[PDB]
Structures are given as C-alpha cells and as structure tokens.
C-alpha cells in the first residue's frame, strides 16, 4: 500500500534521526575528550624529545594506529592463537548466524574470497536449521506448559487469560534461560559488569554483533570447551529470540 | 592553518601603565607563545607555553589564557618594552603566527618642527629638482603633509619616509620629498609644505620663493 | 650560549635562485629541529618549513612547497635554505630558528633583495634653508643599501635624523637631518659625510647658505 | 521430523568444522603480522631519534592506544558521533549489520542501544518487507515484457517462470552486487575483491567492520553518502527476497 | 672525539652504598640515552638500567630494581649511579655506555670492591728449589689489590710470570715466577721486590738456595 | 628475559684461518649487535644491526643472521683479533647479552715446564705451610694438576691461577698452591705435583721429600 510504505519510510527515517540525536548527545563528549587527550600526548612528547618534529610524530601515530587497528597489542613486543581450531570454529559460526563480531579480521585475499561463498551457502543452511529448532523448541515448551495449563483450567480462570498468563511464564522462563541466565553467567566468567553482559547478550541475539564484546575471546582464559559451548547457547537464544522479534513486529503493525 | 588574530595591531602606553595584548585563535589551542621584536633585530622568545618566561625576561611580563583566547600582560610599562609582540601556536601543524602588536611609548604631545628646502644648484645642473620637507620630533605619529606649488596643491612625485620612535625623546619624524624635473620647477615661484597634526587645529606651513 | 649565525645579505636577479646558510654553535645541531621564517618588510612572520637535521626529514608550508628547499650539512653543523625563481615578492628578511614547538633561538636574519639594478653611487646634495636651525643632506640614486651619514666627521651627533631609504625607480633615496643652534651656522661650517660601501664612495658636502 | 533436524544439526556442525579447518589453514600464518609491523615501526623510530628510549616509546604507544580506543583519530570533521555519523550508526543497528568500527564508550550509550534495537529492528524489518514487495513488483513487472517474448517463442510457461527468476536475481545482482563493487573500487581505492567482500558482508548483514563505506560524506561528490544509504536499503531488500525464496525452496525440500 | 670519563675505583664495606660518575664530552649529553652495565670478573655483561638525561626518565633491569639509582647533572653533563646495600656479589666492573638500541660508546669502567677486610700488608715468602732454573715469590695475606712484583728492582724482566690474585678468606694471595739460566743462580743474587701502595709497604726478598 | 647463547665459549684460530661464531636467541629478534673486548679494557661496538661495521672495524669482519640465529665471521684471522666477542639484542626490553666467546691464537703444542717448591722456613715459623707448583709456558690451555702427599692424592686446600694467553709466545701458565697448616705438613714427607697435558699420555711429575 504505497501510502503506508512512504509513511513507514518517514517514520523510520525519524526513528533514525531520533537515534542519532541521542547517541550524539551521549557519546560525542567522550569522543571529543579522547581527541583532546591524543593531542595532549603528542604535545607532551614533543616537549620531552626535541629531536622529533610534530609532523614526524604524526606519522608514527598513523603507523601505530594502523597496526593496532590490525589487532596488534600495545602491551608486548613479539603464545595463544586467534585462529586456533576452537577460535576458527567460532569465527565461522559468526558468519552463518550473520552475527559477525569481527574482533578478528581476515588478512588474506583467499580468506576473503572463501568467506564470501562460505556465507552465501552457510546462512541459508543455518536459517533452515534455525526454523527447525524454533519449531522444535516451541513444541517442547508448549507440551511442558500444557501440564501447568491444566492446573489453571481447574482453577477456573478463563481459557482466554490462562493462555495469556502462560505466555508470561513462557517467555519469562525463556528470558530466564536465554537472556538472564547467560548474562549472570557472563558477568562472573568474563569480568564484565551486569550491564555490559546484557548489552553483549542482546547485541548478540539480535545478530547485530558489534564486536566490542565477545565472550571467550579474552586471551588469558584457559577455557577451551566454554566458547563453542556458548555457541550452543547462541543457537537456543537465536531461535527463542527470532520467535520474539517477529512478535514485537506484530504489535508494531497493529498500532 | 589555525588563524591567530591580534587586535588592535597598534597600541601605546605611558610608563607605569598596565598593558594587555590579546590573541584569539580560530580554533582551540593548548598553549600560546610570544615573541618580542625590536626593529633592526630578530624576534626573541619572550613567553612560551602560555605563561613561562624566557631566561632574559623581567617579571613585569606575564601570560595567560586557554582554549581560544590568550593574553600577554605588562604589569607596569617601561621604556625598553616598546616593541612588537607576536603570538604563535603549534598545537596543529603548520605552526602559525599572529600579525603582531606594535607597542609604542606614550608621551606628551609635540608639534612638528617643520623645515622646507629648495633644490640645490648642484642638482639643478643635472636636470633634476627635489624639494624636501622635514617634519621633526613630533608626537603622536598620525600626521598629514600637503605640498603646494604657487598656492595650488600637488600630489605627484611625492615620497615620504617615517622614522621609528626615537629612543630618547619618544618622538617621531618624517621627510616628504617632492621630486620634479628642472623644467616643472622653474615654471613656478612659490613652494609650500603644509603639515596637519592634532596638536594644533591650524596647519603648520613653511614656504619659500624660487626668487 | 646557543647561537645561530646566518650568512650575509644577498642580492640576486629576478629569475635566479639563492642559497643561504645558518651555522649553529652552543649545542648539538642534530638534536633539535630547524625552521625558516620569512618576514617581508616589517610585517607578519611566515613559517617556511622545517628540517630534522638528524633524519633529513622536511615539511613545508603549502605556500612554499615549490619555492624553498631545506638541507643540512651535519659535519659543519650548518643548515641551508634555497629559494627558487625569485621575484620581487621574495625580497624579505629570512631567519633560521630552532624548535619543535616554540622557536627558542633565532639567527640574526639575512636580507634578500631581488632586483635588476646595478651598483650605483649616490648623488649627494645639500639642503639649506630662530634659536635652532635645521639642515639636511639629500642622498639619491644609489644602489644597493646601505649608506651612512655623519656630520662634521661625527662631531655633530646630537640632533641627527637619517630617514629610511625608499625606492625611486629601482634606486634608493634618503635624506639626513641635523639641528643646530643658529649662532653656530653659518658662523661655523657644517658638512655631511656620506659613505656608500658597495661602490667605495665617500663624499663630503658643505652646507652653504642660499 | 525431530530425527531429521538432528541430522541437519550434524550437517551444519560439519559445515563449521570444515570452515574452521580452512580459515585456520588460511589465516594462522598471518596471525602475527601486525605485531611484526608495530615492532618494525618502533625500531625504526628509535634508530631515527636517539633522544628516545624504547621504554618511553612504549608508553607513548600505550597512551595512543587508550585514546584511539576512546575514539580519537590520527590527524595530519573526523567525528564519528556528529549527526551524520550517529545517523549511520543507528542504521547499522536496525539493519542488524553492526559494523562496529566505532564502539560505544558510555554505559548510557549501551543501555539506550538495547532498547533502540529491540524496537528498531522489527520496525525496520516491516519496512523492509514492504520495500521488498514493492521492489520485487517493479522488477517482476519489467521482466514481464521479456516473459511475453519467451511465451511467443513457445518456450514452456514453466521454464519461462524459471528464466524470469534467473533474470530477476541476475538483474538485481548487476544493480546491487556488481554495480556497487565497481563503484566502491573507484571511490574507496579498494581492490575488486575487497569491494565484493564488503558488499556481500554488508548485504548478508554479517557486518564485520573491517571495511565500511558510508560513515562520512565526501566533498567533491555529494550524492555518494546518501546513495550508499539508498543502496543498502534496496540491496538488503533484494537479498532478503532471494533468501526467503531460497529459504522457500529449502523448507519443503 | 666522544668520551665518557668514569670516576676512580671505590672500596666499600658490606651494607654501605656508593655513588660513581661518568662525565661525557665530545657530544651533547642530553641528546642520548645513558645506560650502566655490570661485568663481574670476566664474565657475562649485565645491563643495569637506563636514564634519559633530558627527561629524567629511568627504567631498570628487574634484577637491579632495588639496588641502583640513576641520576644525571645536566649542567655538568655528568651521569651518576648509586648502588645500595652493597654485598660481596656487587664487586665488579661497572660501565656507563651510550645508546637506545646498540651501545656505541663506553666509559673505561670503574671497579667496585665490597669487603669487610682491613688494609693488610702482604707476607712475602721466597720460593727456592737443567740449564734454566725457576724461582718464585709467594705473596700472601694482603688487602686490598694491587701489589707490584719486580725482580732485581725491575732489571730482571724477561722470563717473569705473575699470576692473578685469588681470595682466601677475605685476603689476596698470588705468586710470581722468574726463570733464569742456572749459571746465573745462585752465582748471582736474585731478589723479588714487592710493593703494596695501600699499606705503604715495600719488601725485598732474596731467593737463597735451600740449605 | 630473552636469552642469548654463544657456543662454544672458547675457540682458537691460526692467522689466515676463517672464524665463525654464532649467537642463538631464545626467541626471534630483528637485529643482533656484537662487541669486541680485550682484557683490561671496555667493550667496543664492533658490529651493529646484524651486519653494519663500526667505524674502525676492518673488512675481514662480517655479520649475518635473522630470526633466532646470528653469526659473526672473520674471513681471515689476524693476530689483533684475539679477543672476546659478545652479542647483544634490544628488540625486547630489557637489552641482553651473550656470555661472550673468547678467541685465542693457535700455536704449536708445548709441554708445561714444571717446578715444585717447599714451604719457606719463614712461612713455617708463622704456622702456615704453602706448597707451590708452577706449570709454565704450555699450549693448549686445557691441563690438569693433581697433588699427592705421601703418595695419597689431596684436592682440598688447593688454589689455582691461570694467566691470559701470552701476547708474544701465545703460551699459557698456571700456579697451583696447596695450603696446609704446619702440623699437617710436618706429619708427612713426600710431596708431589702431577700434571696431565695433551702433549703426553704420561703425567709430568715433580716431587720433593720434606727432609
Ligand atoms: Ca648565497
Ligand atoms: Ca574520532
Ligand atoms: Ca562525521
Ligand atoms: K576493531
Ligand atoms: K556485525
Ligand atoms: K537476520
Ligand atoms: K551483524
Ligand atoms: K545480522
Ligand atoms: K562487527
């Protein structure tokens, strides 16, 4: 319905400008401070090292930036592997899920080329498995609810409301198992704050996958089973979450 | 390409007075430096990093500021402080400079002592004729000269030259030189140099007749 | 006592190029950044560029990218600036100064004159016309700067103004003023002594009453 | 069937182990290239500047890292949180692309981001479905003229349906995959392969962040910055439709 | 001619501390990093730490974090190293050397002896027993190093080996051998002359044949 | 933290011979440097950045290597090349050093000239008794000394001392000193010093009887 389509366009377009205003107002001040700190660091270095021109230091910094950007670590001079078998497994998963954290980048042209086909074939394959698991999990959940639903029907609360309350229990546990449980897990395991962990979980299950936070990626932890196993969580959550994302969609269409 | 504005470009102070000159930057800057220059010699680092004093500098000088606004101050003007002061920045490459602030000594106003001189015979024989006027030892510097030949003004082939403030009496002086060909010169009889200075409302006028 | 000693004034024709130098003493040449700055007759200072004497690295003000080349000789701890295809816009004072954030030491400067004119001696003409009297010397048509003017061989030093030279048709002119008590002149002789070193000219002019 | 999905799980897993082996073999030998480059930069600097100790340069590099980590950029209009870039960043969310080349630093930022997405993604999905339908219509409608030609040529109506799909995607591919990749090559000084990698990583909504095009506007070509936003919208729609139908083919199978 | 001139040898008691210097000439002190290195009698070289004379910045080898303090005096372009809580293992040669990646100039070194022992003069004992014959001097129980051994006041200098001193319970011992033609001894007197400057000891021992 | 091994720690070369000594690093480094040291004096930068030669260094020297393996080479040995060579690294702070490689001049083998000396009467009166043995002017340096008292071997109370290679005959020498109390000494009668050297399968043995 062309009218509706343009209305929707204007709407979203406003949802974005709205987002923009908020993130600017919330993040720009931190950013301008950092830009200031960098310049302070340069100026301090010049005053200490008269054998260095501002312009030369500038190049040093550009070169250092490029290397850190490529995943160099400031702390050391040079063991653990980003591409070790467990981590590579994990990396692939990030593709077919479309999450795409990207905390570790491909460097080889061959890597990029293979990645293209790996995804084109991998994502639809995964989508199908996901639909499958979504149906199967909902079924298991629905059968489970039925037994407690039987108790509500005896208590003479209407079949219409009993169904609604069950939803509340239904998601609340789902959320408990897939949102709340993991966030509590991650806080303790990754040294994140409550809020960081929830941020991570949600960024993950929406498949946004910023990559600022990645469970397991931490170099120090000797926890091999953990990170793929987390992927096991990711499978459940993503399915449970997909069920939800369509539904907030329905509510949105209704208004 | 940060731009530094020093305004005003010229100022004057009596000895004992407090002097403040400012430098505004087109975009923020972490430190400002200042140089003193006396005519005839190179600039000297005077103040650096906003408020540090270079080795030579007397304590009556100070500096302050931040972000986009900076200042140099003399608590109590002295005579040796007459100079041009420049601000400079290097928080972004390329470094840049203000266009300087010229600080002259104030003193009691003085009228120009005026003299006019007719072409020497030696010059005439070679075919040239320069009429020269000295406006000497006056204050302040703003001055206007007018040349008149036979009572009517001429404003061609006139060249002017100002001294720097004199070191001991703090006055200024200037020469004005009307340069003609011997032909033009011999055609007229009366030559007048006319000076307008704020000390008097009525011009000062020196004249001579070729006769 | 850090010191930057620049080479002397330079006179070149339009179109030519020019090289000038700055020797440092009192510190280690290769430890600090060297800069050059232009000042065109008594007006804003313009940073030309820098060189890092230790690394050879140079950067220039975009305005001067084509115009100027900076180099150094480490062994003689000397810095050089070359300017190219000179025009009259290039006539100015040029300084070398040291620093990577503030310019803490400067050379005494070197003056570049870009001009077609040939070495010419001045014509010197007397200027003759109360308690005091003022006399003068007109010194015209000389090149290059400078000239020096004294009076009665230096015996008259109070009351003396020599005005800055100005260009008249590719040549310089100035005059000099001396003021004396009218009892003194013409009872006593007054003579201006003009010297023009470039042309080995030394002239005395008596001021005679009209 | 539950048995069948369990079988499907194993298939995937093998698809993952298979991927793992390839990336490991392809990338492990370059794990440490960036360190090596950093060290080279340090050692070169020391040799040029005898007034600097290794340890002092070390701190410089830590302090620089901290600042870049806060969003600073090397200088020699760069604001990632000015209006235009924040707009773009919000887009990366509701699309679920999530490049992440710019991170949120504030806890408030993270918190708001959660709700922004929960509400934003479904809202965008709906607009996307809408645009997918509207665009598919324009496409299929155009193809209609060529379909008429095939029907005259007595090509079976069933193959005509197939050729139209091939066209349907192939024409999109030209406009949405091939055209942009050629565009970006010239604009971003990326290689042919880098650009395709980018395009596909983007339209799959994987959004690694190693390559990003539309974050800031380009002086001397104004249309660039929006055209990309427009492109992403269409491309995402064209890609979704492929997936739903290839998904559509897949689920019955 | 770059030159790093270290101060003289030092002798200190266990527990004490000690400060030693290195004056640079031939270049700009503040332009280069200064390091100190330890060499314990003829073995591996050990980097102690560095100081940046221009900034005051220091870093130390973990081994020496507690032990050593580096400082500099810019005006006299001199670098200093203080060692603390000295123990016997600190006895070594110490160098100041210049560089931020290779060590391109070194001082001549300075020797630190850490010891409880008190200045003690040596006991000197003769060593008496083919055409060549060998005699010796046993020089034992002296402190500190060094001693000088000559033979016939230096006039017998070919055929002489003086072995390095060794520590025995806080005191030094060495011997010296001289070989001469048997025709020469005992026909001719042979005397080893031992001097110990620290104790102002000068001893002469005639080598006499065993009864 | 990075460890540099130089092996072997000693080696010898005739003049004209080619010499190669190696430095292996516990983990990769980008560059290796080398120093030359002669006894009595400080190390000199010899080679830096793997293969650059310091100012004074003759071209018969070269350096090479990469990653974890580095080498210094003398194309054709000369006599002034006898010295100790050290490698050093500074791709990771802290800088570190190899334990050095001592390079001696080769020469024709020579047997020790051996002499044994009884305690002087002067020493006996003070209650001590040192029996001394000189093993002089031999090559190569590997040698073994054994003490026997009344035929039974003794190893305790023995102190040994080696010279540096002689700068002209390229031999070595050593002293061995058995130090006893006068009591122990007087209890026995036969005292033998016994030397085992490459130059013979049968020890060289000097003896004396207390009476
Ligand atoms: Ca020249
Ligand atoms: Ca930024
Ligand atoms: Ca922006
Ligand atoms: K990143
Ligand atoms: K992503
Ligand atoms: K999705
Ligand atoms: K994503
Ligand atoms: K996604
Ligand atoms: K990402």
Query: Which residues share a beta bridge with C209?
Result: none
Q: Which residues of C touch D52 (CB under 8 A)?
A: none
Given a contact cutoff of 8 angstroms between Cβ atoms, the answer to whether C207 and C156 are in contact is no
User: What's the CATH number where C200 sits?
Assistant: 2.60.40.10
Given a contact cutoff of 8 angstroms between Cβ atoms, the answer to whether E136 and E152 are in contact is no
Q: What are the residues of chain A with a beta carbon less than 8 Å away from any beta carbon of chain E?
A: 48-51
Q: Which residues of D touch C55 (CB under 8 A)?
A: 48-49
Edge-to-edge strand order for the sheet containing E18-25?
E3-6, E18-25, E78-83, E68-73
Interaxial angle between packed helices A109-154 and A159-175, expressed in degrees from 0 to 180 and rounded to the nearest 10? 140
Which has the closest alpha carbon to C176: C167, C186, C164? Answer: C164
Q: How far apart are CA A5 and CA A69, in angstroms?
A: 40
Q: How far apart are CA B28 and CA B45, in angstroms?
A: 22
Q: Which of C116, C146, C169 is the last residue of a domain?
A: C116
Edge-to-edge strand order for the sheet containing B113-117?
B113-117, B128-138, B172-181, B158-162
- Is A207 annotated in a binding site? The answer is yes
3 state SS of F70: strand
Q: How far apart are CA D46 and CA D58, in angstroms?
A: 11
Given a contact cutoff of 8 angstroms between Cβ atoms, the answer to whether E184 and E143 are in contact is no
Cα-Cα-Cα-Cα dihedral of D112, D118, D124, D128, to 10°? 150
Q: How far apart are CA E110 and CA F41, in angstroms?
A: 11
Chains that touch D (3 or more CB pairs under 8 A): A, C, E, F
Assess whether C151 and C52 both reside in one domain: no
Six token digits for residue D92: 């990366």
- Determine the distance in angstroms separating the CA of F87 from the nearest CA of chain A, rounded to an integer: 20
3 state SS of D253: coil
Assess whether F112 and F102 both reside in one domain: no
3 state SS of E101: coil
Assess whether F123 and F155 both reside in one domain: yes
Q: How far apart are CA D125 and CA C153, in angstroms?
A: 99
The number of domains in chain E is 2
Given a contact cutoff of 8 angstroms between Cβ atoms, the answer to whether B83 and B36 are in contact is yes
The Å distance, Cα D210 to ligand 6 centre, comes to: 20
Q: Smallest Cβ distance to A50: which of C31, C50, C55?
A: C31
Q: Answer whether A100 sits within 8 Å of D98, measured CB to CB.
A: yes
Six token digits for residue A93: 């998963």
Q: Which residues of D touch E59 (CB under 8 A)?
A: 53, 55
Assess whether F83 and F50 both reside in one domain: yes
Assess whether C24 and C40 both reside in one domain: yes
Assess whether E174 and E194 both reside in one domain: yes
The distance in angstroms from the start CA to the end CA of chain D is: 12
The number of domains in chain B is 2
Structure letter (DSSP) for residue B2: -
Residue F58: give the domain boundaries.
Answer: 1-107
Assess whether E63 and E112 both reside in one domain: yes
Q: How far apart are CA D79 and CA D88, in angstroms?
A: 12
The number of domains in chain D is 1
Q: How far apart are CA F56 and CA F46, in angstroms?
A: 8
Which has the closest alpha carbon to C33: C49, C17, C45, C12? Answer: C49
The Å distance, Cα C3 to ligand 7 centre, comes to: 63
Contacts of A87 (CB under 8 A, 6+ apart): A81, A104, A217, A227
Q: Which residues of B touch C105 (CB under 8 A)?
A: 45
Exposed e or buried b per residue across D56-70, where buried means at least 16 C-beta atoms within 10 angstroms of its C-beta: bbbebbebbbebbeb
Contacts of D147 (CB under 8 A, 6+ apart): D160, D164
Q: Answer whether A56 sits within 8 Å of C57, measured CB to CB.
A: yes
Q: Smallest Cβ distance to A72: which of D19, D34, D66?
A: D34
Assess whether F139 and F96 both reside in one domain: no
Q: How far apart are CA F172 and CA F134, in angstroms?
A: 11
Pairing of strands E110-114, E10-12: parallel
Chain breaks in chain E (C to N over 2.5 A) after: 129
User: Are F and B close enough to touch, i.e. 3+ CB pairs under 8 angstroms?
Assistant: no
Q: Which of B60, B82, B107 is the last residue of a domain?
A: B107
Q: Which residues surround ligand 3, an ion (CB under 5 A)?
A: D 79, 82, 85, 216
Assess whether C108 and C128 both reside in one domain: no
Q: Which of C116, C133, C161 is the last residue of a domain?
A: C116
Phi, psi of D114 (to 5 degrees): -50, -60
Which has the closest alpha carbon to A73: A224, A222, A220, A209? Answer: A220
Q: How far apart are CA A128 and CA D251, in angstroms?
A: 7
3 state SS of E151: strand
Exposed e or buried b per residue across A72-108, where buried means at least 16 C-beta atoms within 10 angstroms of its C-beta: bebeebeeeebbebbbbbbbbbbbbbbbbbbbbbbbe
Q: Could you identify the residue written with the tokens 């298991």? A: A140
Residue A193: give the domain boundaries.
Answer: 1-255
* Substitution target from B29, B40, B90, B95 for chain C, most C beta carbons within 10 A: B95
Given a contact cutoff of 8 angstroms between Cβ atoms, the answer to whether A221 and A233 are in contact is no
Q: Could you identify the residue written with the tokens 């390091």? A: E35
Residue E189: give the domain boundaries.
Answer: 117-211
3 state SS of C160: strand
Assess whether E2 and E94 both reside in one domain: yes
User: What's the CATH number where F174 sits?
Assistant: 2.60.40.10
Q: How far apart are CA F50 and CA F64, in angstroms?
A: 6
Which has the closest alpha carbon to E192: E120, E130, E134? Answer: E134
Assess whether F91 and F149 both reside in one domain: no
Tally the residues of chain A. Answer: 255
Q: Which of C71, C100, C116 is the last residue of a domain?
A: C116
- Is D99 annotated in a binding site? The answer is yes
SS3 letters for B106-155? CCCCECCEEEEECCCHHHHHCCEEEEEEEEEEEECCCCEEEEEECCEEEC
Given a contact cutoff of 8 angstroms between Cβ atoms, the answer to whether D157 and D150 are in contact is no
Q: How distant, in Å, are the alpha carbons of D36, D235, E154, F15 from that of A78?
A: 7, 43, 59, 41
3 state SS of A155: coil
Method by which the model was determined: X-ray
Within 13 Å of residue B136, how many CA atoms lie on the same side as its CB?
22
Six token digits for residue D193: 């392969």
| Sign of the alpha-carbon dihedral angle for C159, C164, C165, C168 | negative
Interaxial angle between packed helices D224-252 and A109-154, expressed in degrees from 0 to 180 and rounded to the nearest 10? 60
How crowded is residue E184: how many other Cβ atoms within 10 Å of its Cβ? Answer: 13
Q: Which of F107, F134, F162 is the last residue of a domain?
A: F107
Given a contact cutoff of 8 angstroms between Cβ atoms, the answer to whether B175 and C127 are in contact is no
Six token digits for residue E21: 């210097």
Q: How far apart are CA B200 and CA B11, in angstroms?
A: 22
Which has the closest alpha carbon to B88: B44, B41, B55, B40? Answer: B44
Given a contact cutoff of 8 angstroms between Cβ atoms, the answer to whether F70 and F50 are in contact is yes
Assess whether F146 and F97 both reside in one domain: no
- Determine the distance in angstroms separating the CA of C159 from the nearest CA of chain E, rounded to an integer: 48
- Is A232 annotated in a binding site? The answer is no
The distance in angstroms from the start CA to the end CA of chain F is: 60
Given a contact cutoff of 8 angstroms between Cβ atoms, the answer to whether A232 and A181 are in contact is no
Assess whether C90 and C29 both reside in one domain: yes
Specify burial of residue B73 (Cβ count, 10 A radius: 0-12, 13-18, 19+). middle
User: What's the CATH number where A133 sits?
Assistant: 1.10.287.70
């Amino acid at each position: 319905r062309s009218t509706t389509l343009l209305a929707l366009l204007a709407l979203v377009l406003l949802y974005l400008v709205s987002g923009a205003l908020v993130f600017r107002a919330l993040e720009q001040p931190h950013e301008q401070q950092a830009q200031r700190e960098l310049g302070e660091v340069r100026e301090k270095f010049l005053r200490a090292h008269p054998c260095v021109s501002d312009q030369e230091l500038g190049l040093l910094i550009k070169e250092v930036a490029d290397a850190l950007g490529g995943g160099a670590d400031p702390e050391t001079q040079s063991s653990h592997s980003a591409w070790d078998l467990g981590s590579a497994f994990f990396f692939s998963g990030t593709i077919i899920t479309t999450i795409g954290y990207g905390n570790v980048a491909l460097r080889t042209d061959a890597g990029r080329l293979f990645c293209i086909f790996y995804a084109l074939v991998g994502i639809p394959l995964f989508g199908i498995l996901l639909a499958g698991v979504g149906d199967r999990l909902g079924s298991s959940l629905r059968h489970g609810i039925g037994h407690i639903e039987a108790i509500f029907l005896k208590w003479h609360v209407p079949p219409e409301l009993v169904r609604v309350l069950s939803a509340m229990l239904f998601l609340l546990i789902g959320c408990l198992l897939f949102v709340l449980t993991p966030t509590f897990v991650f806080c303790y395991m990754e040294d994140w704050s409550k809020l960081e962990a929830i941020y991570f979980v949600i960024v993950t299950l929406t498949t946004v996958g910023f990559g600022d936070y990645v469970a397991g990626a931490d170099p120090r932890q000797d926890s091999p089973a953990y990170q793929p196993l987390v992927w096991f969580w990711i499978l459940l959550g993503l399915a449970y979450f997909a069920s939800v994302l369509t539904t907030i969609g329905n509510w949105l269409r209704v208004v | 390409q940060i731009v530094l504005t020093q305004s005003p470009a010229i100022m004057s102070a009596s000895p004992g007075e407090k002097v403040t000159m400012t430098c505004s930057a087109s975009s923020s800057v972490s430190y400002m430096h200042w140089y003193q220059q006396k005519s005839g010699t190179s600039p000297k680092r005077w103040i650096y990093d906003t408020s540090k004093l270079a080795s030579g500098v007397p304590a009556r000088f100070s500096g302050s500021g931040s972000g986009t606004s900076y200042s140099l101050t003399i608590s109590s003007m002295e005579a040796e402080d007459a100079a041009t002061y420049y601000c400079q920045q290097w928080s972004n490459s390329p470094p840049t400079f203000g266009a300087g602030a010229k600080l002259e000594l104030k003193r009691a106003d003085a009228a120009p002592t005026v003299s006019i001189f007719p072409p020497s015979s030696e010059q005439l024989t070679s075919g040239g004729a320069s009429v020269v006027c000295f406006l000497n030892n006056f204050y302040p510097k703003d001055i206007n000269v007018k040349w008149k030949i036979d009572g009517s003004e001429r404003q061609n082939g006139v060249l002017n030259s100002w001294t720097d403030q004199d070191s001991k009496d703090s006055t200024y002086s200037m020469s004005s030189t009307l340069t003609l060909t011997k032909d033009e010169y011999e055609r007229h009889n009366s030559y007048t140099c006319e000076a307008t200075h704020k000390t008097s409302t009525s011009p000062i006028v020196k004249s001579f007749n070729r006769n | 006592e850090v010191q930057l000693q620049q080479s002397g004034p330079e006179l070149v024709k339009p179109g030519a190029s020019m090289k000038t130098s700055c020797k440092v003493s009192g510190y280690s040449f290769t430890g600090y950044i060297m800069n050059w700055v232009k000042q065109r007759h008594g007006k804003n200072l313009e940073w030309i560029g820098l060189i890092n004497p230790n690394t050879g690295y140079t950067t220039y003000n975009q305005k001067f990218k084509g115009k100027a080349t900076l180099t150094v000789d480490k062994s003689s701890s000397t810095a050089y600036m070359e300017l190219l295809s000179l025009t009259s816009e290039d006539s100015a004072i040029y300084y070398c100064t040291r620093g990577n954030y503030v310019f803490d030491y400067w050379g005494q400067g070197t003056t570049l004159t870009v001009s077609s004119a040939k070495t010419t001696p001045p014509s010197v003409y007397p200027l003759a016309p109360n308690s005091m009297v003022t006399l003068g010397c007109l010194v015209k048509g000389y090149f290059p700067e400078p000239v020096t003017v004294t009076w009665n061989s230096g015996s008259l030093s109070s009351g003396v103004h020599t005005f800055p030279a100005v260009l008249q048709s590719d040549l310089y002119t100035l005059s000099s003023s001396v003021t004396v008590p009218s009892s003194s002149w013409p009872s006593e002789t007054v003579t201006c002594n003009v010297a023009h070193p470039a042309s080995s000219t030394k002239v005395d002019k008596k001021i005679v009453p009209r």
